[PDB]
Design a protein around this ligand. Structure first.
Ligand SMILES: C/C1=C/C=C/[C@H](C)[C@H](O)[C@@H](C)[C@@H](O)[C@@H](C)[C@H](O)[C@H](C)[C@@H](O)[C@@H](C)/C=C(\C)C(=O)c2c(O)c(C)c(O)c3c2C(=O)C=C(NC1=O)C3=O
Ligand SMILES: C/C1=C/C=C/[C@H](C)[C@H](O)[C@@H](C)[C@@H](O)[C@@H](C)[C@H](O)[C@H](C)[C@@H](O)[C@@H](C)/C=C(\C)C(=O)c2c(O)c(C)c(O)c3c2C(=O)C=C(NC1=O)C3=O
Ligand SMILES: NC(=O)c1ccc[n+]([C@@H]2O[C@H](COP(=O)([O-])OP(=O)(O)OC[C@H]3O[C@@H](n4cnc5c(N)ncnc54)[C@H](O)[C@@H]3O)[C@@H](O)[C@H]2O)c1
Lengths: 321, 253, 322, 253
C-alpha cells in the first residue's frame, strides 16, 4: 500500500484524506495545530507527531497547509527522497516555486500540484479536443471562474500581490496555459478591495488578457461574488481553425429539477479529489505520469504573479520564452 | 468467471469484457443466432443480454431456463450514480406523489420500439416499484430512414395504480441509445438524462457517466438494473405495444 | 378608413386584445353584458357600445372574448350581419357548434378565425416555417409539452368528462402538432388529476396524448397544470423529420439573462404575441392576405380536444375521419 | 424627412427607406466616396452612418461637423427593447454598482477589432453614460482564416470601471453582440443573437433590430444609438487598441 504523509488538517486536507483512503493509500496526518489527531481518528488514518515523523517511511507528501509554508515543507520532503503533491499555488513566489521544481528534478522525486480544474470532465474534455487536433490551431479563448467565498480569508496578503483575486485566477490561468500553451504576455485589471484578511462574500473582479507563444489569446475573468447565487459558475468558449467548443456549468446535466423547486436532488458528478488522488496515487506507484507536471505548477505561479504585477503597475508584463 | 453476451452489437461488449482480467468470453451472439450462448449458459456462464425481440419469447424462456439467476439484462442507465440520486429524491417526497413518467430515446438500431423502449421502461419500473401495467397503447411509423421495422414509435402505459408512462423512440444513425426520463409528481418534476450535453459548439460533446463500466462492474460482481421479473413485465409491455400499433387501440393486460 | 372592430367581453383576455387592436390602428367598440366594457373602453379611449347589436352595427369584424359556451350564438349573430369573426380559443363548446359556425361563415362569405396564440410567438412560428419550407424533410415524430401554474381560480363550470382544465392547456399543443404535422386521424389520451371546474388556483393535473397524423407522423402532447409558479410557465418541444431535428425549451436564456446575484427587475418576455396576432388579423379583415390560421384549423382544434377528452374517459383511442 | 445614408450597403438602406411616406433619401454612399452625404448633411439632412474605416478619422470628423445633432451611427443592438430593459434594470440598481462590462462578438468581416468591437463599445457607452476612456490594452492575431481574425481589448475608464471584449472572424457569424454587465451585487447579460431553437442547425432568435433602428432613425426623440460624440469616443478607443496590439503595452487616451 502506498504511504502518504498528509500535512495540514483544514478543509482541503480533510477532502484529500478521504480521497487518498478511497484510492487505497495508507495515510499519516500531521498539522501544527494538533487537529491532525482527531482528524486521523475520524477517518481511520495514522497520526504523526511531527513533519519528520510524518515523512519517515512515506512514499509521498500531500501538502495542504497555507501557501507560505509550501516552500520549506516541500524542500524537506524532497531532501528526504519523498515525492510531493502540493496544493495550489505551488509556492508563495515564482522564485520559490522554481526552487522547488529544480530540487525535485535533481533529487529525482515526483513533483505535482493539485490543479483540480484539470480533473473535472468539461476541462479534461476540452484539453483532449485541443491536444488531439480536433480544433485545429487554437486562436481565441474566454474563460471565467466566479464564486461566492463562504469562509473568511484569515491570512495576510497585500493588494500588490493580487490578494483574493490571485486565488481565483489560478484556475483560469492554468486552464489557458493547459489549452493554448506557454504565456508570453500578461495584462490584467483588478477591481475591488482585494487585500486580506477579508470577509466571506468579499466582491472583486479581475480581467486578464493572456497572449500565448502560438499567438493565441485568452481572456480570463475571475470573480468573487457577494452571495451564493449561484455558489459557483464556470464558463468558457474556445475557438480554433477547426471550430469552437463552449461550456456553461449552469447548463443542466444528468439530474435536473424541471419544476416545483425541490432541493433534495443534488448531484455534482464524480469528485475531482477522487479523480485527482487516484491519478496521483497511480503515478507514485510507477504508473503513467498524471495530467499535470512540475512545469505546469511553475507556469501557473508565474502567470498569477505577472497578472498581479500588471494590475498593480498598469503595465503589461512580457514573459519571453 | 466465464461470460457470454446477447446483443445486437455482440463484439462491442465482448471486447470490453476481455479487457478485464480473470474473465473469459466463451460465447457472444445476437438474438438471431442465440444457441451458442444458450449452451454456454447451460454450461454455467454468466450471461449479459439486451432485451430480446418481441417475436422471440420462447428464446427468452430458453435463456431463463438455461441460466436462472445467471442471466443479467443490460440496462446501462440504471447504473448511474445520478439515477440513484433521482430514485432517492423521489422516494423521499421531493416531487410529491408520483403520477407520470415521460421520456425519449434515440437509437441507431432498427425497430426502435423493441430496441430502445425497454431502456426507458426499466427506469420507470425501478421508480414505480415494479407496478404492473393495466393497458398499453402505441403507434409506430417508418418515415425516418431504416432497414426493417419501425423507425419511430410512441407508447403510453396505464398502470394498475393509475400512474402513466409515455415514451417516444426514434432511429438515427449517430444516436447513442442513451435515454432521458422525466418523473412528474403532484409537487414537481425531475429529469434524469443519461446523455447530457457536456460541451456546446458545432460538434457538441456528450457528457454523462461511464455507464458501460458501471454496468459491467455489477454484472461481474443484483444491482439497480431490472431483475428477471422486471424484465418480463417490460417485455410484456413491448409485446402489447406492438399489438396496439397494429390494432390502433390499447391492449388490456 | 380605420378598421372597425366589435370587441365582446371585458375580462383579462379582452383587455389584452383591446390594447393590441388599438395598437394595430383599429377602432374598437366594446360590449359586455356585465357592463365592465364601459370602464374598459374609457381607460383605452375606445367606444362603449350599449348592446351586442349596436357593437356589431357598422363593424368590419367581431372579436369574441367571452367564455366558450357563448361563442356559438355571438358568432352566428355576427355572421348574419355580414361581420367577420375572430373567436378566442376554442372556437366553440362542441364540434357540432364549431361546424355550424364554419359553415355559416362560408355561406355568408365572411372571414372566420380563432386566436390560436401559440402560432404567433417566435419559437413555434419558426418551427412551422422550418417544416413548411422543407428544411426538416418529411415529419416523423414530435413531442410537445405545455406546463403552467394557473394564477387565478377557474370560476367557470366544466366537467371531468369534458376534460376540464386539461382541455384548456391541450389546445396549445394539439394546435401546434396539427400545424406542423397535418390532420390528426387518431387520438389517445390519459388524464390524471381532479380536472373539473370550478377549481382553485394552483390545481394540479397531467394529460398525456398521442396523436397520429394522416401522414403517419406521430406526436406526443403533454399538458400540465402545476402546484407552484416555479416556473410560472414552461414550454418544450422536439420535432424530428427526415431532414433533422428541431428543439426548444422556454427555460433557455434569450436576450436578457440574469447570470448571478438574484435580480428581479430584468423581466423581458419578448414582443407581445397579441400585437402580432391582431395586426395579422387586422390586415386580413382589411382585405389583405389570409393569416396563419384558418377556419378549418379552428375546427380541427375543437375536434382534437373532444377526441382526447373522450379517449381519456373511455380508455379507447378515438379516430377522426378526414 | 430628408435622410442620407453612409454605409457599406448604401442601396440596401436606401431601398428600405425610399418610398416611405414623408421620407426621401437625398444621398446614399459608402465611406469610399462620402461627398454627397456630407453635402446632404450640410443642407440639413439627418444621416444614418456606419462606423468608418480606420484611415478615415478626418472624414468622420467632417461628418460630425456637417451633421451635428442630426448624426446617428448604425448600431442595431442598441435599439432592442431587450436592451432598454437591461439599461433600466441596471440604472435602478438591479446589479448594484456597475464595475465591469464584458462581451463577445463574431463577424464574417476581416479585421475584426475595428469591424466588430464598436458594436460592443456602443452598448457599454450607453450604459456608462458616455464615461471617458483613460487607457486601452489590446492583442490580435491572424490564426483564424487580410487583417486580424481575433482580437481582445480591455478599456479602463477614468471612473475606474473596466470593459473587456473579444472579437473573432467566422464565415457564418452574424455580427450580433452579446454583452455582460457586472456589478457588486450580480451580473446581467444582453445577448442580441440568442439561440431560439436547437438541433443540428440552431436557429437564431432576437428582435428585428434593423427595423427598430430605422424606426428610431426616422422618429422624433433621442434614439438609443450612438451620436457623433459617442462614435468619436468609440473610434478613438479602437485606434488606441490597434496601437496597443502593436506595442504590447496599454495606450493612453
Ligand atoms: C470558480 C470555481 C471553479 C472550481 C471548479 C472545480 C472543478 C470544482 O467544480 C469545484 C467547484 C469543486 O470541486 C468544489 C468542491 C471545490 O473544490 C471547493 C469549493 C473547494 O475549493 C473548497 C475546499 C474551497 C472553499 C470552501 C473556499 O473557501 C475557497 C478557498 O479557500 C480558496 C483559497 C479558493 O481559491 C476558492 C475557494 C472556493 O470555495 C471556490 C473557488 N472557485 C471555484 O471553485 C476558489 O477558487
Ligand atoms: C403553457 C402556456 C403557453 C402559452 C404560450 C403563449 C403563446 C405565449 O407564449 C404566452 C407565454 C403569453 O402569451 C401568456 C403570458 C399569455 O398572456 C397568458 C397565457 C394569458 O392567457 C393570461 C391572460 C392567462 C391567464 C392569467 C389564465 O389564467 C389562463 C386562462 O384563463 C386560460 C383559459 C388558459 O388556457 C391559460 C391561462 C394561463 O395563465 C397559462 C396557460 N398556458 C400557457 O400560457 C393557459 O393555457
Ligand atoms: N481553489 C483554490 O485556489 C484553493 C482552495 C482551497 C485551498 N487552497 C489552498 O490550500 C492551502 C490552504 O489550505 P486550507 O484552505 O484548507 O486552509 P486552512 O487554514 O483550513 O488549513 C491550514 C492547516 O494547515 C495547518 N498548518 C499551518 N501551517 C502548518 C505547518 N507549517 N505545518 C503543518 N501544518 C500547518 C494548520 O494548523 C491547519 O490545520 C492554500 O495553499 C490555499 O491556497 C486553494
Amino acid at each position: 500500500q502506498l504511504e502518504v504523509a498528509l500535512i495540514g488538517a483544514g478543509l482541503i486536507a480533510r477532502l484529500h484524506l478521504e480521497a487518498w483512503l478511497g484510492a487505497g493509500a495508507a495515510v499519516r496526518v500531521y498539522s501544527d495545530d494538533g487537529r491532525s489527531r482527531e482528524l486521523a481518528a475520524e477517518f481511520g488514518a495514522k497520526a504523526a507527531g511531527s513533519l519528520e515523523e510524518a515523512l519517515d517511511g512515506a512514499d509521498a507528501v500531500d501538502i495542504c497547509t497555507p501557501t507560505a509554508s509550501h516552500h520549506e515543507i516541500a524542500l524537506t520532503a524532497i531532501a528526504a527522497g519523498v515525492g510531493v503533491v502540493c496544493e495550489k499555488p505551488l509556492a508563495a513566489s515564482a522564485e520559490e516555486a522554481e526552487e522547488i521544481v529544480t530540487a525535485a528534478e535533481r533529487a529525482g522525486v515526483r513533483l505535482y500540484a493539485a490543479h483540480d480544474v484539470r480533473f473535472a470532465a468539461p476541462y479534461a474534455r476540452l484539453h483532449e479536443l485541443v491536444a488531439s487536433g480536433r480544433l485545429g490551431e487554437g486562436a481565441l479563448g474566454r474563460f471565467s471562474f466566479s464564486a461566492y467565498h463562504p469562509r473568511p480569508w484569515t491570512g495576510h496578503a497585500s493588494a500588490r500581490s493580487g490578494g483574493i483575486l490571485t486565488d481565483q485566477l489560478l484556475h483560469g490561468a492554468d486552464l489557458a496555459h493547459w489549452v493554448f500553451g506557454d504565456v508570453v504576455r500578461v495584462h490584467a485589471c483588478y477591481q475591488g478591495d482585494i487585500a486580506t484578511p477579508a470577509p466571506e462574500g468579499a466582491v472583486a473582479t479581475g480581467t486578464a488578457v493572456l497572449t500565448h507563444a502560438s499567438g493565441a489569446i485568452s481572456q480570463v475573468v475571475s470573480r468573487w461574488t457577494a452571495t451564493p447565487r449561484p455558489p459557483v459558475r464556470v464558463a468558457f468558449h474556445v475557438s480554433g481553425t477547426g471550430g469552437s467548443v463552449s461550456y456553461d456549468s449552469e447548463w443542466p446535466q444528468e439530474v435536473r429539477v424541471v419544476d416545483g423547486g425541490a432541493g433534495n436532488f443534488a448531484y455534482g458528478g464524480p469528485s475531482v479529489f477522487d479523480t485527482e488522488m487516484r491519478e496521483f496515487a497511480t503515478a507514485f506507484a510507477g504508473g503513467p505520469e498524471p495530467r499535470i507536471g512540475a512545469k505546469d505548477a511553475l507556469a501557473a505561479v508565474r502567470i498569477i504573479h505577472a497578472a498581479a504585477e500588471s494590475a498593480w503597475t498598469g503595465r503589461a508584463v512580457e514573459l519571453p520564452v | 468467471v466465464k461470460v457470454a453476451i446477447l446483443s445486437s452489437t455482440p463484439q462491442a461488449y465482448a471486447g470490453a469484457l476481455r479487457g478485464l482480467p480473470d474473465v473469459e468470453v466463451v460465447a457472444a451472439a445476437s438474438w438471431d443466432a442465440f444457441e451458442p450462448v444458450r449452451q454456454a449458459a447451460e454450461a454455467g456462464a454468466r450471461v449479459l443480454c439486451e432485451y430480446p425481440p418481441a417475436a422471440k419469447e420462447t428464446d427468452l424462456k430458453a435463456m431463463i431456463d438455461a441460466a436462472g439467476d445467471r442471466l443479467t439484462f443490460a440496462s446501462p442507465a440504471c447504473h448511474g450514480e445520478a439515477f440513484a440520486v433521482v430514485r432517492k429524491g423521489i422516494a423521499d417526497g421531493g416531487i410529491g406523489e408520483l403520477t407520470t413518467v415521460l421520456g425519449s430515446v434515440a437509437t441507431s438500431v432498427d425497430g426502435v420500439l423493441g430496441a430502445a423502449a425497454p431502456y426507458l421502461l426499466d427506469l420507470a419500473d425501478a421508480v414505480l416499484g415494479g407496478e404492473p401495467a393495466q393497458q398499453v397503447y402505441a403507434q409506430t411509423n417508418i418515415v425516418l430512414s431504416g432497414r426493417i421495422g419501425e423507425s419511430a414509435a410512441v407508447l403510453t402505459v396505464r398502470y394498475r395504480s393509475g400512474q402513466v408512462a409515455s415514451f417516444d423512440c426514434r432511429r438515427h444513425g449517430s444516436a447513442t441509445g442513451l435515454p432521458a426520463v422525466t418523473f412528474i409528481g403532484d409537487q414537481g418534476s425531475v429529469q434524469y438524462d443519461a446523455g447530457p450535453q457536456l460541451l456546446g459548439g458545432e460538434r457538441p460533446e456528450l457528457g454523462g457517466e461511464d455507464l458501460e463500466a458501471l454496468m459491467l462492474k455489477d454484472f461481474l460482481g443484483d444491482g439497480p438494473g431490472p431483475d428477471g421479473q422486471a424484465a418480463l413485465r417490460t417485455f410484456r409491455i413491448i409485446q402489447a405495444a406492438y399489438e396496439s400499433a397494429h390494432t390502433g387501440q390499447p391492449v388490456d393486460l
